Amino acid sequence: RIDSVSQLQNVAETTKVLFDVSKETVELESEAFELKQKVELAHEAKAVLDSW
């Protein structure tokens, strides 16, 4: 039981970093979403001038 508890020694100090940096790496990409809007716009513009 000592060994089973001592497996949980430095979990909290590291998982408080895990939680934060994990949700940041999830959720810091709406910039890329709004970049995708401009990318598909320029994609359509290149396509239609290719048609012209």
Partner: protein
């Protein structure tokens, strides 16, 4: 060379009434003006989609949100279910 010169002058001149001076086209019975600069001036946008593809639709991104800003009735159920999963862990 009157061979060369008269062939090349007819070669220039008989389409010169088609391109230089806009006198339509004497030998062609259908006209040449309401085909490419009028009807198929919308040609590539009769070959593509008009008013969405060629107007290109500068469209606002449909804004998705976070989890409805409610961190009580769901986080405490997450903590109780996490007690349950740790009883399974």
């Amino acid at each position: 060379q009157d061979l060369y010169l008269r062939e090349l002058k007819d070669t220039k001149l008989a389409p010169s009434t088609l391109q230089d001076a806009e006198g339509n086209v004497k030998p062609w019975n259908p006209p040449q003006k309401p085909n490419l600069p009028e009807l198929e001036l919308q040609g590539p946008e009769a070959l593509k989609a008009y008013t969405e593809q060629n107007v290109e639709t500068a469209h606002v991104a449909k804004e998705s949100e976070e989890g409805e800003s409610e961190p009580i009735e769901e986080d405490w159920l997450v903590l109780d279910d996490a007690e349950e999963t740790k009883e399974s862990h």
